[PDB]
Every structure is written in C-alpha cells, then in structure tokens.
C-alpha cells in the first residue's frame, strides 16, 4: 500500500517515497495501523536510526502521481545498513532497481507477503531524470549548467532548459561510472563505462588520508593543493607544450610527483585528498568528451551521489568540458542528481 | 662528432648512440682522445655510474646509417640525474626531444660550443617507430602481438608485421599518456591524452606500498590480488549484470572495496600494488579503445615505458582491449618502446 520506488545501489540505497496528501475522512478512517506509523515516521523524521537521511530540499511537493496529489520525498542510507531496513521491515509492492535489487533478492522476501518488482538500473535512470524534468522542482528548473565556466569571477550556477532533451548524454558517477546516450524515451545505450567512479575518490581518499566519510574527503580536498601531487606539464616542459597547444598547467602524470620520496614526505593528506579529487574528475570528464564527440552529442548530463555537496568537482567538470572541447560541449547538472534510479522505479508501479 | 639521439621525458632520459663500426686505420689515427675516451666508455660498460642502464638486448648490430655501418645503442637514466650527465659532459651536435629538450636547454648549453637542437617529442616517437620497424629488430619483427589473449594457457607472444603501418593508433605511455592518429609518415595527430600514466602507477604505488623503485612496485603488483581492493559487478549485483552484458569479474569500482575500515585493514600491499596497475592498465585500455573507434582505426600500438618488464600490463591490454571491443580491435608492442623519441632525435642529425 504504501508507494515506495528504491534503488539499491553497491554504495548508497536511494529511496523515493510519495506521500498522500489528498487523503479522505473515509480513507483516514479506514487506514491500518501500520500504514499510519510508517507515514508519521517517514514524515516526522529527517534521521532515520544512525544513518538514514531525508534530504527534505528535494521534496516535491504537491505532485500529481498515479491520480492523487501527494508529496514526493527522497531518503538515503548506505547498502552496507540495508539489513538493518529489512529487520525493521519485518517488525507492500516493492519496485526495486540497482544491483542490489537482484543481490538482495532474497533478503527482501524474508519480508511476509512483500512482492518485489526487479526493474533495470539504467531503465530507471533514465526514467526518472526525464520525469522529474517534466514535472519541474516545485516551479524552478531541474537543470542547470555554470555560466562562464572558464572564469572564476563570473562563474555561476544557471537554470537550463531540457524540455526537448534528445539526445542526450548521461553521465552516472555512482560507486562506478556508466555513460548511457539517450536519443528517445525509449531509445538509449550503455555507450561505456569507467571503474574510476565515486568509490575510487572515497576509497582512495580513506587509504591515504584516514578520512572516515565522503563528506570529510571533500572537506580535506576544498583545502588541499593537487599540483603538490601532480606532475604538470610545465614540470615536464618548464612551460607550455605549444605544439600540440597543451598548457602549462595541465596535469600531465597524475600523482606524478609522488615517486620522488621527499616529495612524498612533505605533501599533506589535505593535498592528496585534492590530488584523488582532481584525477577522478578529470578522467570521468575526459571519457564523457570523448563519449560525446564519438555520439555526436553535445549535451552532458552528470548524474549520480559523487557530486553531492561536491560543487568543487561540478565546477571543475564545467571548465574542463568547455576547455577541452573548445566550448562544443556544456556541462549540464540534475538538482536531483542521486535520486533518478529510484523514481524510475517507482514509476514502475503501475505495470503490476 | 659523436652521434647521439636523446628524448629527456618527465622521468627518463633515453639515449640512442651510433657506434660506428667500419672505423678506417686513418681515421683511427686522426681522432681526438675525448672520443676515443667516450666510444670506449659507451661500449665497455653497461652500467653508468649508479643509474644508467644500457640495454645490450637491444642492440642493433651492423645497421647502416648515414651511409656508415655501425651499432645502435639503447641508454637510459632518470632525468633526477640530467646533472650528472650534463656535468660528466662538461669534464658535438646533440638532438634532443622531450620536455626537457626545453627544460633544461640552457643547462645543455653550458657545455662549450655544444650545439643543441630541440626537435618535438611526438614528431621524434613517430619518425623512431617507422624507422625501426623499417630496420627490423636484427631481422626479427619489431612488432610482436599475443596471440589467443582470452586463453591463458594458449597466450603467446607472436610476431606481427607492420610493413604497411597506416592508418596506427600509437598509445605512448610514458609518466602520462599520448594517444596519436598515424595516417601517413607525415601526417599525424594527438588525438588525446591521458593524464593516469606511468607516473600515476609509480607515484600511487609508492604512497600505498612504500615500494622504492618501478621494479619493486611490479614485483608486489605479480603477488597480489587486485579483487581484495577493487569492487566487482558480482560484488553489486551477486552476478553478471546481464542486460548489458557486464561479466561479474568486470571491475565496477577501482578501489571501491576500500571505503570499508575492515578492509583497509585486512588488505596487503601486494594487493595494493596490483590494483593500482591493473586500475592504470584498465583505464588506458579503455581510453584507447574509444580513440581508435572514433578514429576507425583498428590497430592500436603502445609503447613508453610503463610497460617495460611488465609482461602484466600487457596481457592485461591484449586481453581486454580484445575483449571489450569484441575482436576489432588488436594490442601491438614493440621491443624498442620506450627509445622511439630517442632514435627520431637521432634520425634528425642531417638537418642541420
Ligand atoms: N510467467 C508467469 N506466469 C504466471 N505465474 C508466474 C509466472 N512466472 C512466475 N510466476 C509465479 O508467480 C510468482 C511471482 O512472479 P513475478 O510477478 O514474476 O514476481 P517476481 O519474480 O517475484 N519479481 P520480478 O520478476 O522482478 O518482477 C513466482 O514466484 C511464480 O510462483
Ligand atoms: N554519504 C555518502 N556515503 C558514501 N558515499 C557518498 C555519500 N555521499 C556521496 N557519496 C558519493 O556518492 C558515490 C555513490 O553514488 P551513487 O550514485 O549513490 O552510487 P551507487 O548507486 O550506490 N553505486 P552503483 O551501483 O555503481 O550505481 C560514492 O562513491 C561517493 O563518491
Ligand atoms: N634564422 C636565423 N638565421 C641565422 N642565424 C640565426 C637564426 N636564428 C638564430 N640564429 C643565430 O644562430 C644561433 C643558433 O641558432 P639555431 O640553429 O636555431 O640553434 P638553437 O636555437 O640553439 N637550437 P634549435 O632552435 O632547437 O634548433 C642562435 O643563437 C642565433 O645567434
Ligand atoms: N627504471 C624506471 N624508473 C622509473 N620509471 C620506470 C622505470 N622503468 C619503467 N618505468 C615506467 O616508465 C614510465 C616512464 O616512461 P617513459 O616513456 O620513459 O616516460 P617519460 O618520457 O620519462 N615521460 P613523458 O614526459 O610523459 O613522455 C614511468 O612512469 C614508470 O611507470
Ligand atoms: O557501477 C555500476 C552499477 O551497475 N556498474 C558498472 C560501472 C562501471 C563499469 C566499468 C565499465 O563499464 N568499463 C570499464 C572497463 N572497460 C574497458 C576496460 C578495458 C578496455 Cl580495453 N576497454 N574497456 C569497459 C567499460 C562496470 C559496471
Ligand atoms: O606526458 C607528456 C609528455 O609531453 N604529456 C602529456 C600527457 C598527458 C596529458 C593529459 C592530456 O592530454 N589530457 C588529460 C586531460 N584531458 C581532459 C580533461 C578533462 C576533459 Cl573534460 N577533457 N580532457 C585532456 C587530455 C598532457 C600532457
Ligand atoms: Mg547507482
Ligand atoms: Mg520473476
Ligand atoms: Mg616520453
Ligand atoms: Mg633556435
């Protein structure tokens, strides 16, 4: 009864749950017990035990789905507590998509009478990025792109407008990368894939900084230098590279100066935190560039909870893709990045 | 007046040298001491001071070239040491390419009356290839493939012919990475680049193994198994993701296992070491991959000297880039690899 779509991803589980709003005396009368505990503690609460989050500046509220009006709201937790969901499960149509949906298969019918529904990963992204662009974030743009990316002064986050998206290409930066071009609501593919996603910055980040959270990684990278870490071009050329039109300050080997050992012994875990940000950033962007000029796509669309709270990787993909492609390719970014897998599912419902 | 090609890259110096061998008894009378000297201390030591190699294996025996018969020699030492050859010289035109053909050509210019012409980097790999394939390696193939890359117990190293050499997509992994298109011997470009080279494996490793030298690094990476580090498709999704046809041992996430404490602290550096190169290996693969698809081209080299004594990064590139592009496309190497810009310099002797 309750209308719930997850996504169980092999980092994050993301959970999109709507709530009624439009309910009748009748209904309200005439609703189970358990049906009204669980609405009253998904709404009552932004924690959830130790480790889920309702990220309450995503709520949608006032949405029109499957006939009734209700608020739509976004909750996440890592995989790594899913069994603590279940066990509180067993103290409903499930939609599931991600890995997980199939890893936990079994898990998920411990739950008595529960009917879990397995929908694609990217079926579902794709999915739900083109709904929630339809509908629009309570009035404002879904979509938004950093004008004049190339210059920090001016640089600022800009609504865009996607009502006629195709084609498109989506970038999903999860524990790893898949890039999917879009060109219909039914028409996309998996172009490729990299493994040096959002798994690779954290678990690199906590082996050689000790970070304990994504959220401590970036706070170490925000005061961080990675050209302590990095070999530049101009430490290869004393300069640019004006042949073949490389600037000085492009990293040429990343973590390259990190095989002298007293270069080693002076750089800071703050330096190496950025260093891990500015490597993994690059590569996804690089691989997205060469991604869209291979599918004659000139939008990008970067999804996925790396860039949560990450404005410093967002900006740097918006200069870097404008830079490298000669201002061909715009860099586009989803207020609801992280949450498209899972309202794709459940916007499945329907089909059973 | 002694023939010497050198390429000065963001961590290795390589030195061809011609040592003639057709010397007339009246030119060995009339030459100067100071070459007597040097030609006896090139071809009568292999080891040069503490850190230059001369790779006897490579040797070009009695090749001919600007109308004389001589040996070609192949020389290396890390660029760190520049001073000590520049200063051992100061105790001749000299062609040099590389980054440090401008880094540091005043410090060249130190050495009296020597004459120092800088010719490019990309230019001098390209002309060095073509020219010992042309040659032949002592009348082996230069170019060799493994063949049956899919079939560990069927894997071999075989020779490859390259007499008709374009179109070629030439990978030149050095501290990073240069992707070129070959068309003709004139006509080339630098498709891309890659800034997670050689210098990103050997910096990497050494912050999370403390390995002290290249050699160290794969002799940890041959013992460890990279799987303990890196999160796999099984590891999200229990199996193969099979809508798109993602095999279960394919990594998801280079490092993703890492964001566990339990799992940093269970993992070795030897699994460590072999993570970051097959992370390394895996994502120039890709990138070549998708280079030579836009390119259409189908045969893809690579040289630079990443992959000197490392016979594991070079099954790992002709396995996966056969793999992952469903058989169109063909890793080639090269037993000169990483001398090519060093022998294009040389080639560049009768220009001036
Ligand atoms: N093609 C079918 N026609 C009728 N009944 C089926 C069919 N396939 C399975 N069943 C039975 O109905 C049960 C539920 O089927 P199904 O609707 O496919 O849900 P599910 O497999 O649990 N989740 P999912 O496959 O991801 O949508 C199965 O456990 C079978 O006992
Ligand atoms: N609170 C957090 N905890 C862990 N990782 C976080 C957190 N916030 C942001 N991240 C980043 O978000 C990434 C996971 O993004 P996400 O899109 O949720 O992936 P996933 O769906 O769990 N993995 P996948 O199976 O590859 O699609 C992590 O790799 C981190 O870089
Ligand atoms: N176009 C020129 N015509 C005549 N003489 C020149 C010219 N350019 C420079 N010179 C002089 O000749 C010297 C050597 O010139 P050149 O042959 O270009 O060698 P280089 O600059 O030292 N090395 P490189 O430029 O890398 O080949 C310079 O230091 C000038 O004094
Ligand atoms: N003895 C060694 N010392 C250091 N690195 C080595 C050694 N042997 C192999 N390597 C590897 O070879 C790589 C350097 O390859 P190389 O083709 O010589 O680059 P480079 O020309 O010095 N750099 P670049 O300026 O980017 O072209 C290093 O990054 C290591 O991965
Ligand atoms: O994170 C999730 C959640 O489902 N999935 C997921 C994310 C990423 C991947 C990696 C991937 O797709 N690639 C990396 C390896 N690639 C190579 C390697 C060598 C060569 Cl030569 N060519 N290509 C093929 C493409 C896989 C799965
Ligand atoms: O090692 C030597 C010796 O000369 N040179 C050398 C080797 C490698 C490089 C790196 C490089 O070329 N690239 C990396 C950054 N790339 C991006 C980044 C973001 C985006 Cl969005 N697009 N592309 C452009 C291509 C540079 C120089
Ligand atoms: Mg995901
Ligand atoms: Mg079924
Ligand atoms: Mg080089
Ligand atoms: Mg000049």
Same mark, same amino acid.
């Given at each position: ?10 980092? =994050? ?23 009204? %505990? ?23 509220? @006032? ?6 009006? &209700?608020?739509?709201? $976004? ?44 929908? @694609? ?15 629009? $974030? ?39 990368? %898949? ?7 039914? !028409? ?8 040096? &996603?959002? &798994? ?5 980040? %906590?082996?050689? +900084? ?14 961080? @230098? ?54 993994? +950033? ?19 669309? $970067?999804?996925? !909870? ?5 404005? =410093? ?24 990045? &992280? ?11 329907? !089909?059973?």
């Amino acid at each position: 009864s309750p209308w719930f779509g997850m996504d169980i991803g092999g980092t =994050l589980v993301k959970l999109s749950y709507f709530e009624p709003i439009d309910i009748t005396a009748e209904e309200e009368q005439e609703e189970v017990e358990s049906l009204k %505990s669980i609405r009253k503690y998904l709404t009552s609460n932004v924690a959830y035990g130790s480790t889920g989050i309702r990220d309450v500046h995503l709520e949608l509220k @006032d949405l029109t789905l499957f006939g009734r009006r &209700g608020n739509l709201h $976004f909750i996440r937790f890592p995989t790594q507590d899913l069994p603590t969901f279940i066990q509180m499960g067993r103290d409903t149509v499930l939609c599931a998509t991600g890995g997980g949906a199939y890893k936990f298969e079994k898990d998920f019918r411990t739950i008595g009478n529960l009917h879990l529904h397995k929908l @694609d990963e990217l079926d579902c992204l794709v999915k739900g990025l083109l709904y929630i662009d339809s509908v629009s $974030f309570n009035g404002q743009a879904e979509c938004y792109y950093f004008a004049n990316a190339s210059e920090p002064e001016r640089c600022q986050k800009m609504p865009f407008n996607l009502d006629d998206p195709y084609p498109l290409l989506v970038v999903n930066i999860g524990s790893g990368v %898949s890039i999917l071009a879009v060109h219909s609501k039914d !028409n996309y593919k998996r172009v490729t894939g990299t493994s040096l &996603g959002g &798994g690779t910055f954290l678990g690199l980040c %906590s082996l050689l +900084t000790g970070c304990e959270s994504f959220e401590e990684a970036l706070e170490m990278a925000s005061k961080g @230098d990675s050209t302590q870490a990095d070999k530049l071009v101009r430490d290869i050329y004393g300069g640019d590279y004006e042949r073949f039109g490389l600037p000085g300050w492009a990293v040429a080997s990343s973590f390259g100066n990190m095989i002298y050992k007293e270069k080693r012994e002076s750089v800071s875990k703050e330096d190496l935190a950025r260093a891990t940000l500015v490597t993994i +950033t690059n590569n996804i962007g690089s691989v997205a560039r060469m991604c869209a000029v291979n599918e004659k796509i000139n939008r990008v669309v $970067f999804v996925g !909870n790396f860039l949560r709270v990450n404005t =410093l990787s967002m900006k740097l993909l918006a200069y870097a893709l404008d830079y490298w492609s000669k201002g061909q390719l715009k860099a586009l970014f989803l207020e609801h990045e &992280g949450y498209f897998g899972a309202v794709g599912a459940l916007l499945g419902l329907p !089909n059973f």
